[PDB]
Design a protein around this ligand. Structure first.
Ligand SMILES: CCCCCCCCCCCCCCCCC[C@@H](O)O[C@H](CO[C@H](O)CCCCCCCCCCCCCCC)COP(=O)(O)OCC[N+](C)(C)C
Lengths: 70, 57
C-alpha cells in the first residue's frame, strides 16, 4: 500500500538519472569547447570575438592634394 | 631594403629658362594660353605617376 500510494517504480528514477547525466555531460563538453574556442580566438584573432577596432578606410581622401607626390 | 634608382646627370641636362620672376609674370597669361597643351600633359603625368623620375621627357 505504501509503495502504491506514495512511491513509484525504479525505472522512473533510472531514466531520470540517465537524462540528467546526459544533460550534464553535454554541458561539460560544451564548457571545455567554449574555453578552447576562446583561447584560440584570443591567441589568433581570426574569429568574431576579440575584434579590436581599427581605423576606417572610408575617411581617407582620394583626391589631388596640391602636390603630385601626396 | 632595395636600391633607389636615380637618372644620371646626362638625363637631366636641358636648355634652362634664364629669365627672372618678373619676366615670367609679365607674359604669364599669354604663356598659359599658348603653351597649355604640353604643360597640362606634364601636369597630368605628374599627378598620375606620383614619381618625378617618370616625367623627365
Ligand atoms: C494501520 C496503518 C499502519 C501504517 C500507517 C502509516 C502512516 C502514514 C502517514 C505518514 C505520511 C508521511 C509519508 C509521506 C508524506 C509526503 C509524501 C508525498 O510524496 O506524498 C503525497 C501524499 O501524501 C499525503 O498527501 C500527505 C500525508 C499526510 C496524511 C497523514 C495523516 C495525519 C495528518 C494530520 C493532519 C491534521 C488535521 C487537523 C488536526 C486538528 C503526494 O505524493 P506524490 O508526490 O503525488 O507521489 C506521486 C506518485 N503517485 C502518482 C503514485 C501518487
Amino acid at each position: 500500500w505504501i509503495a502504491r500510494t506514495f512511491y513509484d517504480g525504479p525505472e522512473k528514477n533510472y531514466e531520470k538519472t540517465m537524462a540528467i547525466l546526459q544533460i550534464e555531460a553535454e554541458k561539460a563538453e560544451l564548457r571545455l569547447k567554449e574555453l578552447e574556442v576562446r583561447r584560440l580566438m584570443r591567441a589568433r584573432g581570426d574569429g568574431p570575438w576579440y575584434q579590436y577596432p581599427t581605423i576606417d578606410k572610408a575617411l581617407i581622401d582620394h583626391s589631388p592634394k596640391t602636390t603630385p607626390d601626396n | 631594403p632595395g636600391i633607389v634608382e636615380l637618372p644620371t646627370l646626362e638625363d637631366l641636362k636641358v636648355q634652362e629658362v634664364k629669365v627672372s620672376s618678373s619676366v615670367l609674370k609679365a607674359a604669364a597669361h599669354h604663356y598659359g594660353a599658348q603653351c597649355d597643351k604640353p604643360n597640362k600633359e606634364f601636369m597630368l603625368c605628374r599627378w598620375e605617376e606620383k614619381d618625378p623620375r617618370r616625367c623627365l621627357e
